Design a protein around this ligand. Structure first.
Ligand SMILES: [Cl-]
Ligand SMILES: [Cl-]
Ligand SMILES: [Cl-]
Ligand SMILES: [Cl-]
Lengths: 286, 276, 276, 286
């Protein structure tokens, strides 16, 4: 097959499709599109439905985990992620230090090179949130990152942000390194004045995400960038293996997976247009 | 500014524009587009035009050099490159071992993973060319890689190929490592039967490419991938995954971003003809 | 200067010195050695000593931070690190998920490729520790990773391990991602039997590490590998394969060059005691 | 096994050996040492000796190819390479643009950052050599790079240089990109005055190196750095396959090969000390 012929003129849909069939790494991008659609459309087989016990009220579908770096949140992918969570396309998110604060920061101003006053407005917001927890919430028992991120989403109440829609649709966001980013800087500065009594526990979040993989009927994993989450998620047999479906995208036993050597902010919106934006997700009601 | 909103539906022009303003490396892609259009539209100032002597019949415009790796020729970029040379958008090409043979091979079959019979047909064509060139070569002036590539383009005579259009439009293609690719494999196999007398001179091409830069009024350079050419230019765009000059390095994969850039430059911007 | 001459025979001291003066990245290795020795020998000037207030009982010397990845602990560098902490050559460690468990595991068996029974023995030790800590933890002041690592070092009580000597010499080890490694795997497996009540607080460690930098007279930082710690220092040495501060980045593999650097710094240079 | 214990004091031999058994990539470095010693000690089996025909006067041993980048020549590895060629440890060299001129340049001064006058002295030498070929040698038939490099080695006549010892011991040096380096710059500058009539043919060198692999009893390949020569060398069956023995070192059917992810100027002298410097090379006389 040949690449796009500019003798025809300019057709951006054909230009995009031409990349998917002739570009460098196009075969891997195509597998990624096929694998993600399999996550969305997966249904139990008739033999599998027989294995379900009475009272097993779980949704009989693929649980979908979305991992991305804080760097992706800085790009326009943030609004792609908002769309995915707004429409319940994924069930859980794993991300890295700085991602949550970037999502909040983009609700106040546009990052061109970040203005001084934009960081200060974000820091002031985070600090008021930290202080509100102390005054109203009970500080004698620690919060987890996912719980703090839920509370921040509800407090922010901005429909352009990922975290507001994650709190609305009960999509849990894990971020073990939350205190290593601007959120942690705000803790440090607040403590220099008024002793900070907030505590952050990591064990409960560790138990949530591992219980969710162990107890899910089928697993799908999409990871954008390097350093997010571990590829091997624990099975229902207490064995750390890959997921049933896995897509890995970055520039660095019957599982179906692919690694795409590409930059996510360029290829992932293209992949979304051929998967999440057109494929209806199975509701799991059997 | 926000990235593409899929609540609006699927609008591929908006997806492309949204990438140019919100993606990773978008600022560098935007500079690349501006710099390439400056190459195409550059004109001498009135002060510069006065410095030209009587009898200087050169085109008073920017000379444009396109460099790309053999790997790019394996992708669909091959047909982007054919378009650029078909329409005289560039003046010179610098490439690497294997690139010419891939352009030839794609005229015979489609690489899905290259079929056995597709390499055999390509090797047979190259081998017939090598034996023919041996007979007519002058041993005091052996042919250079660029001369061999010109002759191969004329012999192939396929309007889907880069090399045929380069020969038609007198766009010289430099490839010092021509004998390090499949071309050389065919030399080695031919040599095991009857010793190969073909000679390939590199000094004359060194002279040719240096004369082209020295004698050009203004230079622009576009390099895709790592490891292509040495030598600075007035305008330069570098794309790979690894004093008044205006240049930019784009950290991106060329087969993805370069067609987007072409759609915003070579495909819409009229190139100055150099006639003053 | 010439590289090592094998006509002279095989002289490993000369091979090492020849690398320091002729190898790729040798100039950066030489700066790293100079900068680290400056950390060890740094003393306040007379003008600086006058600024100290009465009752300031701090050691007037450079505080030294050592950062390394879990991958370094898998190599023989683990025993280099043990030496540095055994002799109080560094004051603080920052490391990543898996590093602590590797130091423990190497006390039970030799990784050639990790034997099954070696992981099982390590997991059993970690699991007994987790259940014991649950019983004595204060839920209004949960333990931090560094506190858990101190207690593990005291419990292990093995003079071949980094963590035992760090606990003996009050060298604090920060590892915010402790629960992301084998330690957390043991939490997950324990949880499937009887729910795990252990809690790990990260804010107090954030307070601890920030107090250490704020309250130190002079800071030195040594980081091996990519992805370790944030936060600038007076002296800094960065080693990985990826205003008056004195720093250098060494593009080298740490398990190869770092022992050479130690032999020219920590192993020969007396560290100032800070008593003025 | 444990790494070096500095409680014993400082022993640089034990420090070096400790790296070979506990460092990162030590297992690959060990395979590389084993494979190179197999190149040096290889002998035909009794069954193989029977297959040799009368009049086959070839040396019945492993032919050894050494490839390295111009960047290695800039390091102290240049003097390691000189030693290897001085002692006939290798049979052929493949290198890249700039390597030969660096070997010459180091005979005139020490590169600290290269002094202006050191490049000028090297350029003057190269230009006098180019002009001498025109005046004395016959210019009507082109030279190959390996031939030019032989002539330069004989002209330089410096026992500290690689090329002088390669010419002495008839070790052929291939460099298809010779005219892409300082040598080519000197051609360009000379032509701007006096038309340069030197011609450089690449086909004859292509035939030499491929004939040598095709016609050798056994092949060994050692490549330091990326971009030197192609790993697949043509067999005696006109099939481009890997060598019988191969060692690849860089930072990026029964063949025995290893890739070492390390920097050559650090690990290669260590490898030499355990191979070329202690292992007697089989002379091939059976
Ligand atoms: Cl679900
Ligand atoms: Cl022109
Ligand atoms: Cl101290
Ligand atoms: Cl031989």
């Amino acid at each position: 097959i040949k690449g796009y012929d500019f003798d025809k003129g300019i057709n951006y849909e054909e230009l995009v499709n031409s990349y998917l069939t002739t570009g460098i790494q196009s075969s891997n991008v195509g597998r990624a599109i096929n694998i993600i659609n399999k996550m969305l459309t997966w249904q139990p087989s008739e033999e599998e439905k027989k294995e379900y016990v009475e009272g097993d009220e779980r949704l009989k579908r693929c649980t979908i985990y979305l991992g991305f770096t804080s760097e992706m949140m800085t790009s326009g992918l943030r609004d792609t992620f908002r769309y995915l969570v707004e429409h319940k396309c994924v069930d859980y998110i794993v991300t890295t230090a700085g991602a949550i604060e970037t999502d909040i920061m983009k609700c106040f101003g546009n990052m061109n090179i970040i203005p001084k006053e934009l960081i200060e407005k974000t820091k002031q917001w985070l600090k008021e949130f930290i202080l509100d927890i102390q005054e109203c919430q009970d500080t004698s028992m620690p919060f987890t990152p996912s719980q703090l991120i839920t509370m921040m989403g509800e407090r922010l109440n901005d429909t352009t942000s990922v975290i507001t829609w994650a709190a609305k649709n009960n999509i849990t966001i894990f971020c073990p390194a939350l205190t290593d980013g601007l959120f942690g800087t705000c803790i440090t500065e607040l403590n220099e004045i008024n002793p900070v009594r907030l505590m952050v526990d990591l064990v409960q979040d560790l138990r949530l995400i591992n219980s969710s993989t162990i107890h899910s009927v089928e697993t799908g994993v999409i990871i954008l960038g390097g350093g997010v989450m571990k590829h091997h998620i624990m099975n229902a047999n207490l064995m750390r293996n890959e997921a049933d479906f896995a897509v890995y995208i970055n520039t660095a036993i019957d599982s179906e997976n692919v690694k795409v050597l590409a930059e996510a902010s360029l290829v992932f919106p293209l992949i979304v247009s051929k998967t999440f934006a057109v494929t209806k997700r199975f509701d799991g009601k059997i």
